[PDB]
Amino acid sequence: IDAFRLINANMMVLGHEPRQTTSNLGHLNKPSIQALIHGLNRHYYSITINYRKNELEQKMLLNLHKKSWMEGLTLQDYSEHCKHNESVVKEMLELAKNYNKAVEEEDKMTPEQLAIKNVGKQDPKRHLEEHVDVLMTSNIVQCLAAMLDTVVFK
Amino acid sequence: YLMEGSYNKVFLAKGNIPAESYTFFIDILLDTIRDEIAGCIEKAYEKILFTEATRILFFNTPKKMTDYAKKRGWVLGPNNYYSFASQQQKPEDTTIPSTELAKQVIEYARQLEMIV
């Protein structure tokens, strides 16, 4: 944002440095070089700003924007969630076959080399813990949310 | 022999007391076997007449059988021990898992995401 205000070019002719710094508050934010290519600081200056925040407003944009009502007391496509619990695990076998491959070429060429070299193709190791988070929270949420409706609904 | 089901070889050893009298011990061993058969008359049996389980302990025909037939079930009838093998009330429990597992599933998520 960076609000500005002019300085006199008459004092630019004088070579005199304006604005008489009397508080340890101005020279906190540094200007960009691209704004320094332009008229800063030969015809204008920068101003430090902040924002007036209050429970009048701050409470009522937080507790009004990201809110939902049923997205979680409901189940999720019950014949297909268990079907989606194979749509990941099937290639997770062969992705573990790559994890049954890449460790086997260790005790080899100095694994800092195994960082620059492997940038063409996907590694198992990072991708193999990627689905484990997905295959967990898709299951633990859907199992727990089903076992509350047994109690609550009769 | 008391450890396995064998009861008759136990009382064949009540025909074999060699050393001294052993009287007060085998008579307590009578009593702890009396309730045990009165315990094991209570399995899943059919009708038994008043001869077969009348002689599985020892007795010929005293009123001691009514002392057992009125203690537990297997009702005194027309030469009959009536079978109350219902075992029907307890199954079909979703609720007892649904209290315990909803505890356990959150217990999975405690040592899953929160660093310890």
Side-chain angles (χ1 to χ4, degrees):
Chain A
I1 179 80
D2 198 2
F4 301 113
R5 190 183 295 161
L6 190 73
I7 204 67
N8 204 171
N10 205 167
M11 196 178 289
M12 183 67 201
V13 175
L14 265 295
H16 188 277
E17 290 84 4
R19 292 180 52 74
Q20 55 98 29
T21 303
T22 55
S23 175
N24 207 167
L25 191 147
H27 299 283
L28 268 295
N29 297 318
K30 300 288 104 176
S32 69
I33 188 64
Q34 292 85 16
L36 190 63
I37 294 168
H38 296 85
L40 188 143
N41 204 161
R42 293 177 292 174
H43 298 89
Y44 60 90
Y45 58 87
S46 296
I47 303 168
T48 62
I49 62 172
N50 55 359
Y51 296 103
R52 298 180 62 86
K53 295 183 288 293
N54 50 0
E55 186 181 359
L56 180 60
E57 195 273 332
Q58 293 294 117
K59 197 266 179 186
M60 70 181 303
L61 195 145
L62 188 146
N63 206 1
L64 269 73
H65 181 70
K66 294 293 186 181
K67 290 173 79 68
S68 64
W69 180 249
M70 286 173 65
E71 291 79 355
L73 258 299
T74 60
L75 274 302
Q76 194 279 129
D77 199 1
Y78 195 82
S79 180
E80 296 294 326
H81 182 275
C82 296
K83 179 66 179 295
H84 187 272
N85 291 320
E86 185 63 32
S87 301
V88 178
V89 182
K90 186 180 262 77
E91 70 271 17
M92 186 267 172
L93 189 148
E94 185 66 31
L95 203 280
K97 183 65 181 292
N98 208 168
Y99 187 64
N100 204 3
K101 181 69 175 181
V103 178
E104 285 78 0
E105 63 250 12
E106 295 296 323
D107 192 74
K108 292 297 288 185
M109 188 67 197
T110 173
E112 57 89 19
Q113 186 64 41
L114 271 293
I116 179 169
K117 181 170 88 272
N118 299 109
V119 304
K121 73 277 193 185
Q122 56 91 31
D123 55 348
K125 181 70 181 297
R126 183 177 178 178
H127 195 199
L128 194 271
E129 65 182 0
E130 189 271 333
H131 295 287
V132 173
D133 195 6
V134 177
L135 288 172
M136 192 67 70
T137 67
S138 176
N139 287 317
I140 302 303
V141 169
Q142 197 275 124
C143 180
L144 193 276
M147 297 197 78
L148 298 177
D149 299 327
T150 62
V151 170
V152 174
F153 293 163
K154 184 70 175 178
Chain B
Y1 291 156
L2 270 75
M3 191 66 205
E4 70 257 7
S6 179
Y7 289 159
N8 299 109
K9 183 67 176 177
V10 172
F11 296 119
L12 286 175
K14 198 167 286 189
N16 193 4
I17 297 99
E20 61 266 18
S21 182
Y22 287 166
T23 296
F24 292 101
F25 298 166
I26 67 168
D27 289 331
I28 295 170
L29 188 145
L30 287 174
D31 195 7
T32 189
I33 283 174
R34 291 295 186 273
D35 54 351
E36 183 177 0
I37 276 84
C40 84
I41 197 64
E42 299 296 321
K43 280 91 175 63
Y45 296 176
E46 70 274 17
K47 169 172 74 174
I48 298 101
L49 76 157
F50 297 159
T51 303
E52 179 72 29
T54 297
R55 66 108 179 90
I56 58 173
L57 282 164
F58 291 101
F59 57 96
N60 47 4
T61 35
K63 296 294 187 291
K64 189 173 73 68
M65 60 179 288
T66 311
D67 200 5
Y68 294 112
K70 301 298 183 291
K71 187 258 291 179
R72 293 294 95 195
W74 296 87
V75 181
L76 182 70
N79 204 4
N80 191 349
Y81 289 157
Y82 290 94
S83 177
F84 62 111
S86 179
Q87 60 183 357
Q88 194 273 128
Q89 192 267 333
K90 80 279 189 189
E92 291 93 9
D93 46 352
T94 308
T95 303
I96 292 95
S98 184
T99 300
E100 293 175 354
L101 271 299
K103 183 65 70 177
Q104 292 181 357
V105 171
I106 305 168
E107 288 292 330
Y108 291 167
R110 294 177 69 251
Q111 56 176 356
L112 179 64
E113 182 69 31
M114 288 300 161
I115 185 65
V116 295

